[PDB]
């Protein structure tokens, strides 16, 4: 029935670390530290309620404990378990939950020969920096492909405005040359009909060249836009695995923590 030996007491932990542990948990999850003041006998309780991680200071006076002025309980564990049986609405209706689900120091693991660190941690860490190098590489050519795509997406839109300008040239060539061809036809001036045609045929000859250059880009786009989506689903497949074995590498430090000193991580330094 002792404090330092509880599940939910971690003590010397940073606020950022408990934020990382309550991330997206359900209401009533909770965890206790010593206050970031690092002050003796002065503690902080975080619990999950309303999507937020909410901080409760736990007071200490005459050996008694509590977290308001009227201060009652003998120990902190009597204080916490009292609110595990019934709601801390007793303290404030504004938060109506019990200290439902503790997060435990231990109760988290993965024969404990020293090889579990010197062999199986270095193994999981090597497996973690390889998949982290791949994902950095993926995210490099992911952003590269992303820019070479928009470069092509605008260039084909340029081709769209150019082809628009040439197609209206054709439709004004036919507009303002119909009744000159029709006038030249009855003057027997085939020499002048073929100048208009030799120029019209040269007009829609070039428009055929830029239309072909457009599709030849829409093709390089189509095929790069696809190899782009593949790079995305590859990252999304690599992200969860990367997290999974990053945590494995982390909590394999626990048996370095059971050894109690990071001597053997510094052996892995040097």
């Amino acid at each position: 029935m002792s404090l330092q030996d509880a599940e939910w007491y971690w003590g010397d932990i940073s606020r950022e670390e408990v934020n990382e542990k309550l991330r997206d948990t359900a209401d009533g999850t909770f965890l206790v530290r010593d206050a970031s003041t690092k002050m003796h006998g002065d503690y902080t309780l975080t619990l999950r309620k309303g999507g937020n991680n909410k901080l409760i200071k736990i007071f200490h006076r005459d050996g008694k404990y509590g977290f308001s002025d009227p201060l009652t309980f003998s120990s902190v564990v009597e204080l916490i378990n009292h609110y595990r049986n019934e709601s801390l609405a007793q303290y404030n209706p504004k938060l109506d939950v019990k200290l439902l689900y503790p997060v435990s120091k231990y109760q988290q693991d993965q024969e404990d020969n020293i090889e579990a660190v010197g062999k199986k941690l270095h193994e999981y860490n090597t497996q973690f920096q390889e998949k982290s190098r791949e994902y950095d590489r993926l995210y490099e050519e992911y952003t590269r492909t992303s820019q070479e795509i928009q470069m092509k997406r605008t260039a084909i839109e340029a081709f769209n405005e150019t082809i628009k300008i040439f197609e209206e040239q054709c439709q004004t060539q036919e507009r303002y040359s119909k009744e000159y061809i029709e006038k030249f036809k009855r003057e027997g001036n085939e020499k002048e009909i073929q100048r208009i045609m030799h120029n019209y045929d040269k007009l829609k000859s070039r428009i055929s060249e830029i239309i072909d250059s457009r599709r030849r880009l829409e093709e390089d786009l189509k095929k790069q836009a696809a190899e782009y989506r593949e790079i995305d689903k590859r990252m999304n497949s690599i992200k969860p695995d990367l997290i999974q074995l990053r945590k494995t590498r982390d909590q394999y430090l626990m048996w370095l923590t059971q050894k109690g000193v990071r001597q053997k991580k510094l052996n892995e330094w040097l």
Binding site: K57, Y139, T154, C170, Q173
Partner: protein, 1008 residues
């Protein structure tokens, strides 16, 4: 936005063919020149057209113009017929002859804005979104306010805009400055030109340091009329003549003393005292100054003028629900990933107004949910600044290991639009890529707005259509509701209420404290510093509390800008709060401190819920009344155009600035085109001839820079690092590529000032394409703040926050420090003492050789001071463990660190670099240098500096906080900033933080 003169081509050949489409359907190939102006083309086309059918139909040359398609896919009407062919940024070499339509002057002006901001202005005309069209129209009155305000007392008010007084924010110079004044006076030299040869003459003066410029002009004409036997009234008659006929300028750059600040408050002379150097001033004719201020009109644009029942939120007696229909374009491996789902949360800033809710999980191959998500909140309880934050997430399962969730894409929505109407009807938004390094399922700091990029994951939603349009209540009812709910002193209390004010912006504020503040919320206006804390205490999912809170802020005492800036960060989105924060700035933030914190103030524009807000109008207002801050206002905005999340917001903001910054737009465009030529040459060096040797690259460089079209673009323009520095002719003699892999360019110009020799005769800057510089910017800026704090406390610790500016995606400028070397370079000017071990005294000896004589004590003082400065700074910022090649020292003895981006990258052990070489110098070459009395007072400088920053720890934590939405990976969550709380030891008392830093210093000398 243009890699070359044609699509995929850097430069046009000297001659090229151009297809010319006439208003008749004839097509004419014209051989022209790369430079052939459009007037040359139009003439020689209509001269060759007579060789092609149907010439009869063409009107006169002067009645037509060209239109073509730019590499920006703009159909651009080339009204400015004076441009060269090769400057059009043509996509393909063709020109379509058309009759000009629309206001010529306007169209010519928009092309010039488009080049400046980097995108065609006409892309804005096509925007469906009415917020955009309302923004464009409704900020044109902030521009008319500024143009009229600066064209008021022409030409002085027009000069005060272009050449604003560069002043310290207070004339109270701290004592250590005054101690370099001869019995409270300063000696100054005034220079004058004698024109037949531009000969020059000088007049030395001793004057009270607090003389206004006109009083300086008095003491100079008074000294030249010494022997003129003038009467007291004839003297007044020519003192008056010169006081109003001339002004003073800084020799070597474009700084002017146009306003009657005391002389020593002008920054140039505040440092001439601090550095003990002679302030060199040039007397100049006012009519010559106003001559180079060409009158600039501001004309309202076309969109400015024309365009071709409801119920209150608080009647809605129902909870909130939101439908998620389906997704699109989701890139997921159907078998590595088991299922997908949409996660949502209703957020006011970063605090969930209610717990999150998800759709049920769904297979990858069919991303459809058609699910109404119900939220534990009342629609009346919605605060105005509420926001829906959502993401698509993947899951991968296992029993021997936990189930893993990852975000695939994210998006945020404003529940109330800019017309404070609550959204309704079915909606669809494309989602953004999850930023690198983020693993939170949601991203509530990301910008609200749909991803414009195509083939990106598109999610559809529906918001309840309540029987009519719904608006947020008008302030009237909100206040009377506070009067409804309010009907439903102290000692220790007030002691702790102010004991809360001391604590930094990120301190743990436990529940008992926030609702204790909410209780004494009315006693809080006696300690207005507490306002940010009390706001985080408001339960924003209660309209009762929020209403009561609006009343307190409406009558809140103005806090000072260093505090008001926090309320513009991401944790304070309420438009009333932010409005109060802006009013504090526009009445207490000097143009100086505005220029100082401009990076952050621009950055927090990303958090603004809507385009048109009180903040942007304040920054834009100031940006158009002060061309110094307007310069960096432009470049900081322009530097992030590429980021499509803000390209619109910033683009619309730049459009306005460029449309009203006057004749300065012309200068900025010359800067932009100069940078464009530099980026297109470095892109060529990095992409094409990367494989070529380093001397092959050198020859392409010098030959390319030999080209006339290049030099005419890279010579004669203003340095974006400081527009006061004119950059004249290039010294190709000195230009070079550099040893880094990205091979930055060392660029060196002559200084064209008539008296350039009195400042620096040639100015050199490094241009680096391929490195993210904005960490250097923020680090160098922050270093400038810390030097500013120390100086005002009296600590004469000299830092070197050299000029750094990002102009785009991994590209910018870095000021070269003249007569400076690295510590690695200086060890290499020494010899090997130990066994393959550089000589530790080598630094001390090189400093002796460069400072022979009575100046030796000065250099040791400068080194021991600047060293102490960077020692403290780099530890606080975690910049501690630097390589010898990243620490530099001038021949002067001033030490300073460099390449901060290089360090943060190399990241993925020592508190700070206090090597032995430094101790040799600090102690003046002594044995057991850690026990002397130079070191005894050196570590007394370090100590006093550390607590001097902790005494201002609130300002810095706020500056960094404002940078979170920037996208810098070093600044993605408030967890990142937690490191500065550890080095400043803010959860410990002063003496504990002191002893913490002292143990780090004993470990910093690697033993002691």
């Amino acid at each position: 936005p243009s890699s070359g003169e044609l699509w995929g081509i850097h430069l046009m050949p000297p001659r090229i063919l151009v297809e010319c489409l006439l208003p008749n359907g004839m097509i004419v190939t014209l051989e022209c020149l790369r430079e052939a102006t459009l007037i040359t083309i139009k003439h020689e086309l209509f001269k060759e057209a007579r060789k092609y059918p149907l010439h009869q139909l063409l009107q006169d040359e002067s009645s037509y113009i060209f239109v073509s398609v730019t590499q920006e896919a703009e159909r651009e009407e080339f009204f400015d017929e004076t441009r060269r062919l090769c400057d059009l940024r043509l996509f393909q070499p063709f020109l379509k002859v058309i009759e000009p339509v629309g206001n010529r002057e306007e169209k010519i002006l928009n092309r010039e804005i488009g080049f400046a901001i980097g995108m065609p202005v006409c892309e804005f005309d096509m925007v469906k979104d009415p917020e955009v069209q309302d923004f464009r129209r409704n900020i044109l009155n902030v521009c008319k306010e500024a143009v009229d305000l600066r064209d008021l007392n022409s030409p002085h008010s027009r000069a005060m805009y272009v050449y604003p007084p560069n002043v310290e924010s207070s004339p109270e110079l701290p004592k250590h400055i005054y101690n370099k004044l001869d019995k409270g006076q300063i000696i100054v030299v005034i220079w004058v030109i004698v024109s037949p040869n531009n000969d020059k003459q000088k007049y030395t003066l001793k004057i009270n340091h607090d003389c206004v410029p006109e009083q300086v002009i008095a003491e100079a004409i008074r000294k030249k009329t010494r022997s003129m036997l003038l009467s007291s009234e004839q003297l007044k008659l020519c003192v008056l003549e010169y006081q109003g006929k001339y002004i003073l300028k800084v020799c070597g750059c474009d700084e002017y003393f146009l306003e009657k600040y005391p002389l020593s408050q002008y920054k140039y002379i505040r440092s001439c005292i601090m550095l003990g150097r002679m302030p060199n001033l040039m007397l100049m004719a006012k009519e010559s100054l106003y001559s180079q201020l060409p009158m600039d009109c501001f004309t309202m644009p076309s969109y400015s003028r024309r365009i071709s029942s409801t119920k209150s939120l608080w009647v809605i007696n129902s909870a909130l629900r939101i439908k998620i229909l389906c997704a699109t374009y989701v890139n997921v491996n159907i078998r590595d990933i088991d299922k997908i789902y949409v996660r949502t949360g209703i957020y006011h800033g970063g605090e969930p107004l209610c717990d999150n809710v998800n759709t049920q999980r769904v297979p990858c191959s069919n991303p459809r949910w058609n699910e109404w998500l119900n939220y534990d909140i009342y629609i009346p309880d919605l605060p105005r600044a509420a926001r829906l934050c959502l993401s698509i997430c993947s899951v991968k399962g296992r029993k021997g290991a936990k189930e893993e969730h990852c975000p695939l894409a994210w998006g945020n929505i404003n529940l109330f639009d800019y017309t404070d109407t609550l959204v309704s009807g079915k909606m669809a938004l494309n989602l953004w890529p999850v930023p690198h390094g983020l693993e939170d399922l949601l991203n509530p700091i990301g910008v609200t707005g749909s991803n414009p990029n195509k083939e990106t994951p598109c999610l559809e939603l529906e918001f309840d259509w309540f029987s009519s349009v719904v608006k947020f209540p008008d302030m009237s009812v909100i206040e009377e509701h506070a009067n409804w709910s309010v009907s439903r002193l102290r000692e220790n209390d007030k002691e702790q209420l102010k004991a809360i004010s001391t604590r930094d912006p990120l301190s743990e504020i436990t529940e008992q404290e926030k609702d204790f503040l909410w209780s004494h919320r009315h006693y809080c206006v006696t300690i207005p510093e507490i306002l940010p804390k009390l706001l985080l205490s408001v339960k924003w999912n209660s309209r009762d509390e929020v209403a009561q809170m609006y009343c307190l802020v409406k009558d809140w005492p103005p806090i000072k800008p260093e505090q008001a800036m926090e309320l513009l960060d991401c944790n304070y989105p309420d438009p009333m709060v932010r409005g109060f924060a802006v009013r504090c700035l526009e009445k207490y933030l000097t143009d100086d401190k505005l220029s100082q914190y401009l990076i952050q103030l621009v950055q927090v524009l990303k958090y603004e819920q809507y385009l048109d807000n009180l903040l942007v109008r304040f920054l834009l207002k100031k940006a158009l009344t002060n061309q110094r801050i307007g310069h960096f206002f432009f470049w900081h905005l322009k530097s992030e155009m590429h980021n499509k999340t803000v390209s619109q917001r910033f683009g619309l903001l730049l459009e306005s600035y460029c449309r009203a910054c006057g004749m300065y737009l012309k200068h900025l465009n010359r800067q932009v085109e100069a940078m464009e030529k530099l980026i297109n040459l470095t892109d060529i060096l990095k992409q094409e001839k990367k494989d070529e040797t380093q001397k092959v690259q050198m020859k392409f460089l010098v030959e390319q820079m030999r080209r006339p079209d290049f030099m005419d673009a890279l010579q004669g323009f203003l340095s974006p690092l400081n527009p006061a520095h004119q950059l004249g002719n290039l010294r190709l003699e000195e230009c070079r590529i550099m040893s880094s892999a990205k091979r930055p360019l060392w660029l060196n110009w002559e200084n064209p000032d008539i008296m350039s020799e009195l400042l620096f005769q040639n100015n050199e800057i490094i241009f680096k394409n391929g490195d993210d510089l904005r960490q250097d910017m923020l680090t160098l800026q922050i270093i400038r703040i810390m030097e500013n704090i120390w100086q005002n406390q009296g600590l004469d610790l000299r830092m070197l926050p050299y000029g750094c500016l990002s102009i785009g995606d991994c590209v910018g400028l870095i000021e070269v420090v003249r007569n400076s070397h690295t510590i690695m370079q200086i060890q290499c000017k020494g010899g090997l003492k130990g066994a393959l071990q550089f000589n530790s005294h080598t630094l001390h000896q090189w400093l002796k050789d460069k400072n022979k004589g009575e100046i030796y004590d000065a250099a040791i003082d400068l080194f021991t001071r600047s060293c102490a400065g960077y020692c403290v700074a780099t530890f606080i910022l975690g910049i501690g463990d630097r390589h010898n090649s990243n620490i530099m020292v001038k021949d002067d003895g001033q030490l300073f660190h460099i390449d901060f981006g290089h360090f943060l990258d190399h990241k993925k052990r020592v508190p700070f670099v206090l090597t032995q070489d430094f101790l040799i110098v600090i102690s003046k070459g002594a044995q057991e240098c850690t026990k002397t009395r130079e070191f005894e007072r050196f570590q007394e400088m370090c100590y006093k500096a550390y607590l001097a920053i902790r005494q201002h720890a609130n300002l810095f934590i706020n500056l960094f906080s404002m940078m979170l939405g920037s996208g810098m990976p070093e600044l993605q969550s408030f967890d990142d900033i937690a490191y500065i709380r550890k080095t400043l030891a803010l959860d410990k008392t002063e003496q504990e933080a002191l002893e913490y830093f002292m143990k780090q210093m004993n470990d910093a000398r690697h033993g002691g």
